[PDB]
Design an enzyme around this catalytic site. Structure first.
Site, PDB file in Angstrom:
ATOM      1  N   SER A  42       0.794  -1.230   0.000  1.00 49.11           N
ATOM      2  CA  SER A  42       0.000   0.000   0.000  1.00 49.11           C
ATOM      3  C   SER A  42       0.828   1.282   0.000  1.00 49.11           C
ATOM      4  O   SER A  42       0.282   2.378  -0.139  1.00 49.11           O
ATOM      5  CB  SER A  42      -0.930   0.020   1.217  1.00 49.11           C
ATOM      6  OG  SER A  42      -2.064  -0.781   0.878  1.00 49.11           O
ATOM      7  N   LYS A 206       3.066   6.833   4.864  1.00 51.18           N
ATOM      8  CA  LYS A 206       2.135   5.865   4.291  1.00 51.18           C
ATOM      9  C   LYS A 206       2.687   4.461   4.539  1.00 51.18           C
ATOM     10  O   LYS A 206       3.803   4.142   4.137  1.00 51.18           O
ATOM     11  CB  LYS A 206       1.965   6.056   2.768  1.00 51.18           C
ATOM     12  CG  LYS A 206       0.972   5.072   2.051  1.00 51.18           C
ATOM     13  CD  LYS A 206      -0.499   5.292   2.461  1.00 51.18           C
ATOM     14  CE  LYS A 206      -1.379   4.069   2.155  1.00 51.18           C
ATOM     15  NZ  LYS A 206      -1.319   3.099   3.244  1.00 51.18           N
TER      16      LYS A 206
END
Length: 257
Positions: A42, A206
């Site tokens: 991701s 992230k």
């Protein structure tokens, strides 16, 4: 030394660790397997979000464009898009949900808008990133099979591109500021890089995770009295059902900072 410490950490963890720290005060780096490919998982959502911000530079209406969320749109992990079935979400809300909650339906809608995974790769190339490649949509981009080139990049390539995106030339100022706001608002990263840092420091990040206990995190760090640091910590294991090891990313961040 830092290299010896990272070597020991990698050895006792049972996996493969990739680290790239860029100190923007002098552009000096700390690198450990920084040229090896790792599955992004991701952490690739940043490049999909940034690709849409790049388009919004030329199109004033863009980020407000609403997208219908159907029950057929939902995949496994959709914490925010699940609250909007039968309703709509703007491309700005999709960007935010993809980054701050790692929503997979949000990622897929942004790739569908851009025209597919190859358009994200072409945006990466336009940034001077020659390493990044996005091949699949979510969630199969998380298979993280050892030696598979699909949906991979190297720690140094992602650290350079993340620096350019958040602190450099990649995006116009309003778009660069929006990306930074979304990364600082991340809700999924407490146990990773952030946990290995001073509490006073501001972090935008992230995370990513996948099979083969693949545990990733990419971060921009704003210390209280120094220039920003960009850190990428990628970690992967030999066995398919290995547990994720967010604590190894927090340990590596503690060592290099």
């Amino acid at each position: 030394s830092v290299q010896q410490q990272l070597e020991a950490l990698e050895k006792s963890s049972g996996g493969r660790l990739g680290v790239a720290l860029i100190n923007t005060a002098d552009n000096s780096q700390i690198l450990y397997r920084a040229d090896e490919r790792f599955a992004m998982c991701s952490t690739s959502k940043v490049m999909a979000a940034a690709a849409v911000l790049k388009q919004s530079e030329s199109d004033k209406h863009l980020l407000n464009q609403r997208v219908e969320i159907k029950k057929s749109d939902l995949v496994n992990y959709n914490p925010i898009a699940e609250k909007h079935v039968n309703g709509t979400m703007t491309l700005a809300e999709l960007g935010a949900a993809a980054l701050q909650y790692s929503d997979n339906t949000a990622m897929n809608k942004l790739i569908a808008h851009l025209g597919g995974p190859d358009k994200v790769t072409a945006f990466a190339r336009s940034l001077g990133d020659e390493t990044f490649r996005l091949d699949r949509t979510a969630p199969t981009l998380n298979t993280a099979i050892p030696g598979d080139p699909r949906d991979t990049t190297t720690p140094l390539a992602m650290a350079q591109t993340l620096k350019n995106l958040t602190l450099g030339k990649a995006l116009a100022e309003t778009q660069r500021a929006q990306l930074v706001t979304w990364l600082k608002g991340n809700t999924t990263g407490s146990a990773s890089i952030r946990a290995g840092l001073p509490k006073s420091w501001v972090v935008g990040d992230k995370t990513g995770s996948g099979d083969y206990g693949t545990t990733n995190d990419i971060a921009v760090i704003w210390p209280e009295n120094h220039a920003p640091l960009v850190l990428v910590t990628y970690f992967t294991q030999p066995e398919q059902k290995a547990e994720r090891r967010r604590d190894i990313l927090a340990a590596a961040a503690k060592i290099v900072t």
